[PDB]
Design a protein around this nucleic acid. Structure first.
Lengths: 109, 108
DNA sequence: GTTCCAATTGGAA
DNA sequence: GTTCCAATTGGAA
């Protein structure tokens, strides 16, 4: 039914796990899991660290609550053991997914 | 004298090559070769693509040129055949060095 | 429809 | 004295 990703006990189903083509790039697979671990609006209103951008402290932008550190830690643990990538690659794939989810939400308006 | 880097025909200091510790990270070594291939004033005025930032298209920033594509292509060629890092990593290390060298000038 | 590019920034590392 | 982290952008791929 469901499978724990990492030591923290965060889990997704085997159905969506088996519905993934592992022939594509790591970051893309990471984005596929984020829509399976988190929801759409959560990714759109959260960031990787919960910090504001240093390049916008003048004009500012909506402060976003930090994503779950425990859930992300398992994802980083997965990709580094399965696809054998670096945590830097994963955390960059994550921080660019939340940003793209923020774009798309604005596209409905 | 000086040693070529890639097929596009760009060379670097033969001494400086020997003075590089390859035990370091990919991006690190890449940031050491850039200062030996490009002048510091060039890095502080040039970028990877030459394009401006999409987040600052209305906020007009001073124009910064593009680094020599042939010189960059050889740099990317070296790291992939030696340290076996990805072209992604190399191009990201370059766009930071050019951004960091600009921070040096801004402080001065 | 989604991802990639890479430029910009300040403090932290 | 340098590098790293990652947030944010709009068009390009």
């Amino acid at each position: 039914p469901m499978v724990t990703i990492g030591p923290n006990g965060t889990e997704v189903s085997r159905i969506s796990l088996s519905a993934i083509n592992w022939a594509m790039t790591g970051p893309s697979i990471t984005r596929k899991l984020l829509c399976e671990i988190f929801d759409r609006d959560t990714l759109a209103h959260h960031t990787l660290s919960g910090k504001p951008s240093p390049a916008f402290r003048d004009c500012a932008r909506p402060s976003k609550q930090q994503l779950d550190p425990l859930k992300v830690a398992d994802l980083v643990y997965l990709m580094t053991n399965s696809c054998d990538m670096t945590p830097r690659e994963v955390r960059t794939a994550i921080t660019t997914k939340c940003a793209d989810e923020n774009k798309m939400l604005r596209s409905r308006m």
